[PDB]
């Protein structure tokens, strides 16, 4: 699927995906765990909180 960033994720570690509120976060593989989705911004990829995006 794909979902709209509701709050901005400001990552410290270069593995957790950093993104801004508004961005189109397209999901690659959430079929792993509900907590942290493996997704694609546009330019780069990483882990995204369920809470931070408009998943539903």
């Amino acid at each position: 699927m794909e979902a709209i960033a509701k709050v901005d994720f400001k990552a410290t570690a270069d593995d957790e995906l950093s993104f801004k509120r508004g961005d189109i976060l397209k999901v690659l593989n959430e079929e792993s765990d509900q907590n942290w989705y493996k997704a694609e911004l546009n330019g780069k990829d990483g882990f995204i909180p369920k809470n931070y995006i408009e998943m539903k």
């Binding site: 709050v7 765990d33 907590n35 882990f47 909180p49 931070y52």
Partner: peptide
């Protein structure tokens, strides 16, 4: 209440 960040998991 702020939007929470889940634990990454070992």
């Amino acid at each position: 209440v702020p939007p929470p960040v889940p634990p990454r998991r070992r």
